[PDB]
């Protein structure tokens, strides 16, 4: 007593690139140095 | 009996993520923030 689909494929990630874009920060900067003053020595 | 023998197939290595979009897949990236640091750390001129 003698005794399969065929086709095209197309695979496809999940994709972990994160998403970039860029930020504006607008803020200021105050800086206070503070010195002594005797002869010509500023200290 | 025709028997026909069985093809040798070289399997590949497989890449699904690549390594330059491994890294470009965290939002927090120490390399580029230790560097951010260090920039800020320079900001004094006279």
């Given at each position: 007593t003698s005794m399969l689909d065929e086709g095209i494929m197309v695979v496809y990630k999940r994709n972990i690139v994160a998403h970039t874009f860029k930020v504006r920060v607008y803020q200021k900067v105050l800086t206070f140095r503070r010195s002594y003053a005797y002869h010509r020595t500023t200290y | 009996l025709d028997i026909d023998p069985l093809e040798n197939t070289d399997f590949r290595v497989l890449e699904l993520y690549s390594q330059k979009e491994l890294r470009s897949s965290?939002?927090?990236?120490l390399e580029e923030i230790m560097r951010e640091f260090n920039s800020y750390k320079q900001r004094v001129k006279y």
């Open positions: - | 965290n939002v927090f990236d």
